[PDB]
Design a protein around this ligand. Structure first.
Ligand code: HEM
Ligand code: HEM
Ligand code: HNI
Ligand code: HNI
Lengths: 145, 140, 145, 140
């Protein structure tokens, strides 16, 4: 439940987001900070060091898809469960990703936005984004329930 | 905790300096605004922006972490008094340590961008997880 | 999401449950194994030792209400969200208990059921009670989603 | 890990003894049936009731636990080689250790009703989490 004022600040900050790099930066950091998550990306190639993970074209390419799905969720805050319905079925029944890792990628994304925006990513702007990333993780974990 | 992790953490926390108290208080506010369940641990405290108690409490957290970046090789004996205070007295759910660690990371990313690289991000996350293990190790 | 055979095997074991001991035992075990949970039970008295936690009349009496909700949940498995809806308002909005603890008490109740029923609590019987306790934990956590 | 925790864990293996392998395989099957995602880690394997692979691997898991009870004071070096396999080769989601550990407690409760007192249950959970901590330590 996002308040109209925090619902506005979220879209205002997201508008300044580089759709080509932020997704790949979040996925890349996930694989570095939480190395067990690399087990789902063995077909991606070189992920030996932070530099190889961050410089992996497949990581940047897949990150762009992941970020695109975060944009769809922001556009449909009142229908998150429905928005991520086929992605939930995919991640849970086809990919076997434990739902705890959706929480971790959300928090890594919040860390990426803090890194890029700095002082613009204030504590009430982070609180609004925590509602969003929690909503997405919960929407993505739905076929597990 | 690798030698490189200690090298990265000491560097990242070195660039914090006098801003320590300001960072600790920001991370606490980030935690209270983002995770309301955490507020119930402080009913006596004024939890509005720029409150004297949160500002004062922020310095303590920051200094304890500065003590932890120093005694990185022997953290369990160093934070012993805190380990008993959080677990035995305050009864802090281990979940809330994850919430503060992330908010401490968000504060670091927002203030030290050039220093918050994927490698340093990992070390800082690994270190805050170590502090949290030490502060939840004394449950009876 | 239980199979027709899982529904009978669960209701069979729950019929042989001590509706005045099991709940208090489960509430008791949670406070000993996970001592932070004692924080929401200041008004309960001495909880410094397992036997004080087990020998507490308010733990037994409160545990009875807890198992009653679990029983109530078993009658409305297709509407768990509505069954625990008012309790979700209590635990989340009033008490501010973290929803991870809902999973822990659920798994503790699985440990107490395995303890009492022995070999009657087979691996397929556990899998079915795991779906129930996750569903109850998810229903109780609903006001955080 | 309290001195009374180790005492309760030592006494718990006592009643397990030769049942170890059987209890291990039983904990594996409980994990595979309650949490089917854990089955993806064993591709070649036959995980059905009374399989030779489950029985054999269940003996191995129980074997490591038996080794850890005797090396309760020095668990990080006792599981050294295993720590490399789980974090480098296998890359097992740390969540799956909490699942297996819970199934290990379930198996024990259903076979040791006189031994699984609130005090022993609390002690066993801490020990299995300590084993999980070591097996999920070499993440790079
Ligand atoms: C929490 C938010 C997440 C979102 C929005 C997300 C989104 C996506 C999207 C949109 C796809 C593309 C699906 C398609 O083209 O049909 C995808 C594929 C995938 N995702 Fe996620 N994902 C998330 C978290 C994760 C996490 C945490 C992991 C693993 C640790 C993961 C692992 C995968 C994998 C392995 C695939 C298949 C990649 C491939 O080989 O093509 N995802 N994800
Ligand atoms: C109590 C915690 C655990 C213990 C003591 C344990 C112990 C072992 C042992 C002793 C081995 C064989 C070592 C060798 O042959 O060099 C092994 C292998 C393995 N373990 Fe575990 N394990 C644990 C948890 C897990 C979990 C949670 C999973 C995943 C759900 C897992 C998946 C595996 C796999 C896939 C292998 C390799 C089996 C093979 O393909 O041959 N283990 N484990
Ligand atoms: C949300 C709960 C919570 C968490 C996660 C938490 C996590 C941490 C972490 C983790 C990185 C650190 C370094 C830390 C440090 C401290 N805490 Ni925490 N504390 C928490 C709730 C408290 C409470 C409550 C007190 C008592 C405050 C007071 O003084 O009234 C406390 C007091 C302190 C003190 C003051 C000690 C004293 O009074 O002698 C320090 C230092 N801490 N706390
Ligand atoms: C550790 C915290 C905690 C957990 C994990 C927990 C888990 C659960 C679970 C299973 C997940 C169930 C089915 C459940 C059911 C109940 N709880 Ni919970 N409760 C908890 C803390 C409480 C507290 C505290 C109360 C007292 C509220 C009151 O009004 O008596 C409570 C009260 C209840 C009541 C009675 C409220 C009343 O009569 O007003 C029921 C029923 N519950 N609680």
């Amino acid at each position: 439940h996002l308040t109209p004022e925090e619902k506005s600040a979220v879209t205002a900050l997201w508008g300044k987001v580089n759709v080509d790099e932020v997704g790949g930066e979040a996925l890349g950091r996930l694989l570095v900070v939480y190395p067990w998550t690399q087990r789902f990306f063995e077909s991606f190639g070189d992920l030996s060091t932070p530099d190889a993970v961050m410089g992996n074209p497949k990581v940047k390419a897949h990150g762009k898809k992941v970020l695109g799905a975060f944009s769809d969720g922001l556009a449909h805050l009142d229908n998150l469960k429905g928005t991520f319905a086929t992605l939930s079925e995919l991640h849970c029944d086809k990919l076997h990703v434990d739902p705890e890792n959706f929480r971790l990628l959300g928090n890594v994304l919040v860390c990426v936005l803090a890194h890029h925006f700095g002082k613009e990513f204030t504590p009430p702007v982070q609180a609004a984004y925590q509602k969003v990333v929690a909503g997405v993780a919960n929407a993505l974990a739905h076929k597990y329930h | 905790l690798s030698p490189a992790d200690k090298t990265n953490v000491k560097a990242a926390w070195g660039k914090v300096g006098a801003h320590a108290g300001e960072y600790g208080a920001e991370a606490l506010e980030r935690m209270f605004l983002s995770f309301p369940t955490t507020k119930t641990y402080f009913p006596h405290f004024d939890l509005s922006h720029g409150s004297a108690q949160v500002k004062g409490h922020g310095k303590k957290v920051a200094d304890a972490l500065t003590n932890a970046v120093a005694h990185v090789d022997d953290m369990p004996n160093a934070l012993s008094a805190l380990s008993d205070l959080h677990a035995h007295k305050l009864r802090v759910d281990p979940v809330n340590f994850k919430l503060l660690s992330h908010c401490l990371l968000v504060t670091l990313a927002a203030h030290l961008p050039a220093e918050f690289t994927p490698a340093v991000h990992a070390s800082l996350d690994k270190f805050l997880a170590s502090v949290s293990t030490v502060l939840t190790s004394k449950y009876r």
